[PDB]
Amino acid sequence: SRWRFPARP
Amino acid sequence: GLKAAQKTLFPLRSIDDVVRLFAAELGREEPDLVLLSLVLGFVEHFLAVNRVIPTNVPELTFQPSPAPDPPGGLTYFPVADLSIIAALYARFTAQIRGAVDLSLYPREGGVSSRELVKKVSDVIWNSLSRSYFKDRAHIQSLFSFITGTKLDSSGVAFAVVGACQALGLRDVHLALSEDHAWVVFGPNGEQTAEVTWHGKGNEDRRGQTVNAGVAERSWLYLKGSYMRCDRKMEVAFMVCAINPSIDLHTDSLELLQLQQKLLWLLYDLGHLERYPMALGNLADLEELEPTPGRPDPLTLYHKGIASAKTYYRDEHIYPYMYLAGYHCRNRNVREALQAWADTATVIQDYNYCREDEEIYKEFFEVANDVIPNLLKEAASLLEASALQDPECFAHLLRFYDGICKWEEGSPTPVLHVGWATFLVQSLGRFEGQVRQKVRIVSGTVAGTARGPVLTFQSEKMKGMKELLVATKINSSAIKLQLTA
Fold this sequence. Notes:
heterodimer, A: little secondary structure, globular, B: mainly alpha, 50% helix, phosphoprotein (chain B), nucleus (chain B), phosphoprotein binding (chain B)
């Protein structure tokens, strides 16, 4: 994961 | 600039030492986000971003300790000199108090002007770098902001809020939907502001209000049931923003332990109570590396859904997605299809809008990849059951129902021909003997005086309650119905 919205599943 | 009661807790030489700063900063009335972000960012940097140890920087030191599993001899940790951390703190505060002066912003007893907020916003926004990709890893913290000027979408909103704490404004807070961030402020915190961009498109609505997005019933804004944070919740967000990814396939052990522990800390302090997604993250963590004396993952996913229903009108999608995942990964088709249906049950009272692309893709994967793959796998496990339970067939149907209802009253159409092939194919994955044991009733009498049952809510799914229960699935027909 490079960047996903924080706390996303 | 820093208080003495905070300085004393330095320097940090282990994951534990870090937890102390958080448990101690969390016990004050105004936890310092700027301080906690810097520490986190600092730590995450030498652990995930640049792991090679510099030997020419007498100011930066590392701390040896026994490595977790039998594998390895010694592990190294970046010692957080008080000097280094305080230097960054001061640099941040200078940019702020030095680029905005509260001299001209009369606050009538504990409120902040919309002009002040929109200013602090601009201050941070214009401080941003010109040359960088907005989706890259490890630019969420203020350590990133102050150091390289790089910040990601959500990280910008966090910065704006931290900046306001630095200026003394204690009414400005982080507002969190499932895919967006903005700022809330005012007396009783009902006034809102947009501070960061959304999606690939640099399209911002800065200075504008969320009222329009809440109005149009889009999932980005959760029909107004989005999170309104407090200092404590914003610290949680921060912990959840920790990105333990070293590489596409590699993860930092220390950063995982760190984030896992800090979530418990927050859980025991009860600060996870109104943060469903946090409960989810904590859960997923545990599944992989459980800690002794703590509840099961499954326990946690539910405490997460409980929170959604209690404090957010059960209008959140992810607490189900989280759970459906757990089962799917743990090969429990029945329980999985159940939760995916529960998901569509929420999405059905929304509208698919321009900015809701992320959740669209999340259903598209489930509907077209993940589910047709649990079924494909199931059609081979009995041949060597659940593929023969009507209730599961209902779950699947209810799932599609919700997605159909969702589409209703929407700008952009959800369903297209490509959704059909996997509906047809997933139906065919169930024997007619079973697809007929499901009672598709509309309604016997309403109210009350003084196989399994299933009622559709979508006019689309209603018109097909017969084709879905045939012995021969009319491919051509279900297609031309699903899309209209």
